[PDB]
Design a protein around this ligand. Structure first.
Ligand code: MEY
Length: 207
């Protein structure tokens, strides 16, 4: 298991997300679905020139899976996925130029929801999750698991769980007071409000 530090601005962003009083936490789902849509756009794009890219799975979709027993909400997509290097590079060790000014804007009152437009919407997961596990499989690498409970670090390890074929699964281990996100009606409402016209099918599983 390898442990990495979050880049300083990323850690600062995570703390802002966890600490700032902001009731509109439901935006986390819109942001994770947006990332899934980008990943699906990318594999679709690559397949236009190389159909064999879809050998690991032809279906391009997003599934939302609540599990009340585990207190988890999982967002699964069959997008391009991430290699180990992609996880490290994109989920914690590098901050895009402009991140410092963006956080200064948040502090002066800009809406936390702007993290999506800026390109750091994944971290919205920490509005509702005490821990996030990201399981991913890219055609060019083996299956990996990234994980973090914030606190300034994340881990990466090869994953031995159920093979995914291709894509990414974000497992949100919900905070005790955020169980509304395991309810069918609540998830349905959020998807309709914020993600109704995504260009790939979104299936909300039930229990
Ligand atoms: O697995 C992948 N591959 C993805 C490829 C892109 C392309 N855009 S990018 O800026 O080049 C970029 C490249 C690699 C990793 C990125 C991670 C986040 C945002 C942009 C990233 C977008 C999302 C991707 N995801 C993914 C990630 C999260 Cl966090 C999620 O919740 C669900 C997901 O499917």
């Amino acid at each position: 298991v390898e442990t990495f530090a979050f880049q300083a601005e990323i850690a600062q962003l995570m703390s802002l997300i966890i600490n700032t009083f902001y009731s509109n936490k439901e935006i986390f789902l819109r942001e994770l679905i947006s990332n899934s849509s980008d990943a699906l756009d990318k594999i679709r794009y690559e397949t236009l020139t190389d159909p064999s890219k879809l050998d690991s799975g032809k279906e391009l979709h997003i599934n939302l899976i609540p599990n009340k027993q585990d207190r988890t909400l999982t967002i699964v997509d069959t997008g391009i996925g991430m290699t180990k290097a992609d996880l490290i590079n994109n989920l914690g060790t590098i901050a895009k130029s402009g991140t410092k000014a963006f956080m200064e804007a948040l502090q002066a009152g800009a809406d936390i929801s702007m993290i999506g437009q800026f390109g750091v919407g994944f971290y919205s997961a920490y509005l509702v999750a005490e821990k996030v596990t990201v399981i991913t499989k890219h055609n060019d690498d083996e299956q990996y698991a990234w994980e973090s409970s914030a606190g300034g670090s994340f881990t990466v390890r090869t994953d031995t769980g159920e093979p995914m074929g291709r894509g990414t699964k974000v497992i949100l281990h919900l905070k005790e007071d955020q169980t509304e996100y395991l309810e069918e009606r609540r998830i349905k409402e959020i998807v309709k409000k914020h993600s109704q016209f995504i260009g790939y099918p979104i299936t909300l599983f039930v229990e």
